[PDB]
Amino acid sequence: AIYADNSYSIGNTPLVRLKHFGHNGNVVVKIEGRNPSYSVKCRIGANMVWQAEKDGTLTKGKEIVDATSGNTGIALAYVAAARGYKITLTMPETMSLERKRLLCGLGVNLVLTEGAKGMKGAIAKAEEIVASDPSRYVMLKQFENPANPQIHRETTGPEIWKDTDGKVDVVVAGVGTGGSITGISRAIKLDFGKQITSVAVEPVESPVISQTLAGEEVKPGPHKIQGIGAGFIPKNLDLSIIDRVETVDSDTALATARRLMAEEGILAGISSGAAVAAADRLAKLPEFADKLIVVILPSASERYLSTALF
């Protein structure tokens, strides 16, 4: 069991039962912060690179380009370093010095874009770089690359099945690209045949999945639950396997993450708090009393989630 490089050490994250949430221990969390790069994205960063290698789109010498400096960019940076690929990430010049130093420390060629243009500027710049030499650059496109939900169907989902001896009844997961809930749900429902309840979680401030499914006018909005609530329906969110959608507000997601730290000794990010808050709400409904609810905690926090942070 010696991994050839750090990209192969992804997953096999632990399930921990919560003591101060749920009803009679019916809430169990899957800690994705226990991963390389400290988040669930290590899985998709690894698999999008591996799949691009297998299908020939990524060869020795071509370079990776993207516009994410969030968990996916960090994940791609680690995988690129671990497998020997050059990688350029665009990002608004207003990003933190800490995030910049982290990406540079990983070997990333960081291209800073105009602060005033925000993520639109960085995305446009990444597209510009690829367009300049399409045969040299590869943009993996996390919101639509099938290798994203596929790695969750092959690893994350089976891990939940295995660690719960097939007893999982409900899976609760915040939606960013939608890969986690999609891949996990396909694994458990289609590959293992159990008709569980799949619950997507989104910010009440940008409830686009809820609005969409209700046939209401789609109105995205700003929120502080980093990692989820992209403001649109990504191609990697398989709405057909979603049974329920729970909304959670930013303040509650924050308070919940803080409680996980102080009351359970679990160091998770704000989106983990959002997922647990949604899961706790369902766990205290009589209908879910005898059901095992597994909640994905997407990332870890190495710091207390201060107001400055949120």
Binding site: T68, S69, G70, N71, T72, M91, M119, I123, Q142, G176, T177, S206, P220, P222, H223, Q226, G227, I228, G229, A230, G231
Partner: peptide, 4 residues
């Protein structure tokens, strides 16, 4: 919120 695309900076995921």
């Amino acid at each position: 919120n695309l900076n995921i």
